[PDB]
């Protein structure tokens, strides 16, 4: 009955495609061509954070929009005071092959993980003056590509075993496991209300999940290459992706389809990271051409370029107040732009 | 600056100094990537996640990285080994007839993919040809015909081993800035560490010539 089941799956896919086509009446560009564009955005580098001696893969802002954590191949997790370019902590890592890092919203914990298939949790606040590792989370069968905190006791992880997981830091156990991707999941994006989250994988698909119930609600398929970056809109009703097809696409949760495409003919390198502005008007994306391109989300027009790195831009992120953008890259430098 | 901002700057400088010392100690070390097929055997040259083994051979510190337990897309994590000193590739000469697609052709495809990788253009490869005794005892019964329909040679250990090694280095493209070192693994001897030592010494000499800017 394999052929019959495949035919049923194809019929269901055709029905979903027909529904998606029927739900489209006017494109986003058609009804945003009458909005006022922003001409150019010239952001200068305000701070250059030096101290890393290897390639920077991830960085995360804090809630206070002043503290940030960065991870590099040197085996160090450095907490920076971005206002004075001061270094608060320098956390050695048991494994130097880190690929992601996160900041707890309470500011008490920092997480990291990578090729060791372990998500480590570190305690910043301690009676002694040293940062101590709280516990190691094991159970993933592939590299950890992203991790995000829900609260002090819940963290969500994405791995290369085509599976996302939700952990309980009190007991170090898998509360809920997410399955359905056929490729390695590379990026995570928690919703503003922390009830859903989207994940983009190597199957050129993005899946919207339910944290509490544990099932997949929607699947978005427009990309032609593996998705490296994902980020939620500030209102939580849309998200943007980035893959190695030199293309960013904005998907809608309610309309259940792609809205806008952000691509250029002269751009051929892949996208390593993506983020949104505070109002959601700007889409900042990091590329492999040592550059960060600022996109007008509602117009699909390049509004600026952040050209200050001599190697591949691997991560970026906007503060919670929209004050600054921290761009990390492979030249062992972090740059704060405003 | 306040009385505590100055102390914060002092702490920042202290951990700057610690970072510099740690970076110097790390830069005084060589890094090796252990690759190859699973059936070839990566534990012969040594005796969840990736395994790092550290050893010191005549005042040189080594950092092995076995990545054989990562059953994922290599293209998504092979770039983190861009700065490795050398790659140790293990291929068993005994698997020219066993089929899980012949194992030997799987090793050939993996060698071709690694050698011409866009991240390892000038990265040397230390080819290890393992299972010499089993291959020698096996070539007297099954010849190289199953592995190579176009062999057209004799049936002896030396000629067949040389032919396999020649084909494996013939897989190399752009043989101008890359060197392939081929060694036959010795059972009752400690010459493998010596061979890796000479390969990494040549790589250090090349890097010092490039740094001194007379290459």
């Amino acid at each position, epitope marked *: 009955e394999l052929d019959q089941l495949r035919q049923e799956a194809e019929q269901l896919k055709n029905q979903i495609r027909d529904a998606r086509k029927a739900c489209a009446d006017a494109t986003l560009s058609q009804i945003t061509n009458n909005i006022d564009p922003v001409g150019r955005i010239q952001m200068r580098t305000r701070r250059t954070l030096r101290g890393h001696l290897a390639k920077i893969y991830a960085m995360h802002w804090g809630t206070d929009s002043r503290l940030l954590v960065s991870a590099s191949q040197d085996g160090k997790l450095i907490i920076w005071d971005s206002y004075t370019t001061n270094k608060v902590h320098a956390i050695p890592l048991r494994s130097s092959w880190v690929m992601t890092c996160a900041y707890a919203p309470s500011g008490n914990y920092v997480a990291c993980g990578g090729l060791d298939n372990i998500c480590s949790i570190y305690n910043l606040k301690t*009676r002694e003056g040293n940062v101590r590792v709280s516990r190691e989370l094991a159970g993933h069968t592939g590299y950890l590509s992203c991790c995000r905190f829900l609260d002090d006791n819940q963290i969500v992880t994405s791995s290369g075993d085509t599976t996302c997981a939700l952990w309980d830091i009190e007991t170090g156990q898998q509360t809920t496991t997410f399955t359905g991707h056929t490729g390695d999941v590379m990026s995570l994006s928690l919703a503003p209300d922390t009830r859903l989250f989207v994940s983009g994988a190597c199957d050129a698909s993005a899946k919207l999940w339910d944290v509490r119930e544990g099932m997949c609600r929607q699947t978005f398929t427009g990309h032609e290459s593996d998705i490296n970056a994902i980020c939620f809109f500030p209102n939580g009703n849309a998200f943007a992706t980035g893959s190695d097809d030199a293309t960013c696409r904005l998907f809608d949760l309610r309309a259940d389809q792609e809205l806008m495409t952000y691509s250029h003919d002269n751009i051929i390198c892949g996208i390593t990271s993506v983020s949104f502005s505070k109002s959601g008007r700007l889409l900042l994306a990091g590329y492999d051409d040592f550059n960060c391109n600022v996109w007008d989300a509602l117009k699909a027009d390049r509004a600026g370029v952040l050209a200050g790195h001599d190697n591949r831009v691997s991560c970026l992120g906007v503060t919670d107040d929209g004050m600054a953008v921290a761009t990390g890259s492979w030249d062992s430098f972090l740059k704060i732009w405003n | 600056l306040s009385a505590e901002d100055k*102390a914060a700057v002092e702490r920042s400088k202290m951990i700057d100094r610690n970072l510099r010392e740690d970076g110097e100690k790390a830069a005084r070390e060589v890094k090796l990537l252990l690759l190859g097929a699973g059936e070839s055997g990566k534990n012969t040259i040594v005796k969840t996640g990736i395994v790092e083994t550290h050893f010191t051979f005549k005042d040189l510190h080594f950092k092995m990285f076995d990545v054989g337990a990562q059953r994922s897309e290599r293209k998504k994590w092979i770039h983190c080994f861009e700065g490795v000193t050398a790659i140790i590739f293990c291929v068993a000469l005994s698997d020219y007839d066993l089929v899980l697609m012949n194992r030997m052709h799987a090793s050939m495809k993996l060698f071709d993919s690694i050698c011409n990788n866009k991240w390892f253009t000038d990265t040397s490869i230390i080819l290890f040809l393992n299972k010499k005794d089993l291959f020698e005892e096996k070539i007297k019964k099954s010849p190289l015909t199953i592995c190579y329909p176009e062999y057209a040679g004799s049936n002896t250990y030396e000629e067949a081993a040389a032919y396999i090694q020649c084909q494996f280095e013939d897989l190399n493209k752009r043989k101008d800035t890359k060197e392939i070192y081929t060694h036959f693994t010795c059972s009752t001897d400690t010459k493998n560490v010596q061979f890796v030592f000479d390969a990494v010494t040549d790589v250090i000499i090349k890097n010092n010539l490039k740094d001194c800017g007379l290459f």
Partner: single-chain antibody
Amino acid sequence: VQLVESGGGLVQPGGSRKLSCSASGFAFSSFGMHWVRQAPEKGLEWVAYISSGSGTIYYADTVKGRFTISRDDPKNTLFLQMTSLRSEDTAMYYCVRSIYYYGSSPFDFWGQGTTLTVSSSDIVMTQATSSVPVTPGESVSISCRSSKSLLHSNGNTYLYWFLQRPGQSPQLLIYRMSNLASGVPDRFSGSGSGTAFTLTISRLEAEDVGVYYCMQHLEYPLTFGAGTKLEL
């Protein structure tokens, strides 16, 4: 976490003594150390400071040139060498932990202290209130007035509140103005602006009795204030 001081005892005037302090329970090298003394019937007074890495050393004016502060990080010991002892340096000497980064809680831990007996400009903090009569379950306010504004251009008001219970070493309640400390119940509130500051206890308890000291960390030397004693 414990700092245990040693030394002290009777000493002839003009003599010499060396005070010690064994630290055990924390990353000693990462903490800056302070020495603070207290006369047998008076308030606290800052003496000396040594930073992490022994980079910066600061002394009080009344002790400069005769007192030497030092640390031995591998053996986790802090020293205070005393030379030319006068009759005005008879007190109980405390050791205070102090760490310094963004969001730190300096002066968090204090030692028990040892007594030394000798045989026979800086801004000031004013606490005019003393011997304030209190009752359990009430709300009291303890006021501290300085001579200069402690609000720096960093936006931090550098006012510290301490509680010395009878027979016990002082404990930090609020490190920067309106910043509660670890282990302190959430009934102590800090308030103030510029020169005037207040510490408010919404609900009282029998363990909240003692002497409340007010300290400034804006600029050296660190100056305390004559504490406002609470009593029933």
